[PDB]
Amino acid sequence: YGIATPKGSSLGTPVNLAVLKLSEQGVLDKLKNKWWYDKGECGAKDSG
Amino acid sequence: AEDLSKQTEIAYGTLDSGSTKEFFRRSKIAVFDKMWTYMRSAEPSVFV
Amino acid sequence: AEDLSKQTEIAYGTLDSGSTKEFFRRSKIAVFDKMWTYMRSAEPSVFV
Amino acid sequence: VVVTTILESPYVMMKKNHEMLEGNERYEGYCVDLAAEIAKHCGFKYKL
Ligand SMILES: N[C@@H](Cn1oc(=O)[nH]c1=O)C(=O)O
Ligand SMILES: N[C@@H](Cn1oc(=O)[nH]c1=O)C(=O)O
């Protein structure tokens, strides 16, 4: 999964640097663990 | 409450306005946090 | 890994220096975080 | 900067009062919040 930039976009370099800065802070990961798991209310444990 | 928060078979409601509901709002214990994410996520409303 | 991280019967080790150990160091997924808190808490050392 | 996003949970979701809120306030989700952390740093106005 990647950010789609048009061929010759001015936002080809700053978006790619924004990709790195969110990753270096783990902010990509701290969004993923938050949104999937506060919504995970039917955790598979409950039917088991 | 650890046996409460780990099973979603049972619903958890408190009063519409009181010292109990506000206690779980400003709480930051992980067990107490996970309950308040459930108390807000009420379909239908758990509160009375 | 969810069935890994929820049971401490099994031990989890990786290489002493490589891309796998460092992947769980800078990770911030909650399942991946809880493993790295266990990987550091190794008596004896899980790593090889 | 016109941001095209497709309508699919959990990446782009509809707010509860989606007829009431418009534009950026209408849309919630993961790619929405991903757009906000990028456009904060890369300084561009984003329209969803
Ligand atoms: N009296 C309490 C309210 N309350 O009523 C209950 O039945 N539980 C409870 O916390 C307060 O001062 O807010
Ligand atoms: N080749 C890997 C190291 N590695 O060896 C394994 O057996 N697993 C593993 O991640 C690297 O480039 O760090």
Curated annotation (Swiss-Prot), chain A:
Upregulation: Down-regulated in the pyramidal cell layer of CA1 in the hippocampus by global ischemia.
Subcellular location: Cell membrane; Postsynaptic cell membrane; Postsynaptic density membrane
Feature type site, description Interaction with the cone snail toxin Con-ikot-ikot: 21
Post-translational modification: Palmitoylated. Depalmitoylated upon L-glutamate stimulation.
Quaternary structure annotation from Swiss-Prot or TrEMBL: Homotetramer or heterotetramer of pore-forming glutamate receptor subunits. Tetramers may be formed by the dimerization of dimers. May interact with MPP4. Forms a ternary complex with GRIP1 and CSPG4. Interacts with ATAD1 in an ATP-dependent manner. ATAD1-catalyzed ATP hydrolysis disrupts binding to ATAD1 and to GRIP1 and leads to AMPAR complex disassembly. Interacts with GRIP2. Interacts with GRIP1. Interacts with NSF via its C-terminus. Interacts with CACNG2, PICK1 and GRIP2. Interacts with GRIA1 and SYNDIG1. Part of a complex containing GRIA2, NSF and NAPA and/or NAPB.
Task performed by this protein: Ionotropic glutamate receptor that functions as a ligand-gated cation channel, gated by L-glutamate and glutamatergic agonists such as alpha-amino-3-hydroxy-5-methyl-4-isoxazolepropionic acid (AMPA), quisqualic acid, and kainic acid. L-glutamate acts as an excitatory neurotransmitter at many synapses in the central nervous system and plays an important role in fast excitatory synaptic transmission.
Extra remark: The postsynaptic actions of L-glutamate are mediated by a variety of receptors that are named according to their selective agonists. This receptor binds AMPA (quisqualate) > L-glutamate > kainate.
Domain remark text: The M4 transmembrane segment mediates tetramerization and is required for cell surface expression.
Protein's name according to its UniProt entry: Glutamate receptor 2
Lineage: Eukaryota, Metazoa, Chordata, Craniata, Vertebrata
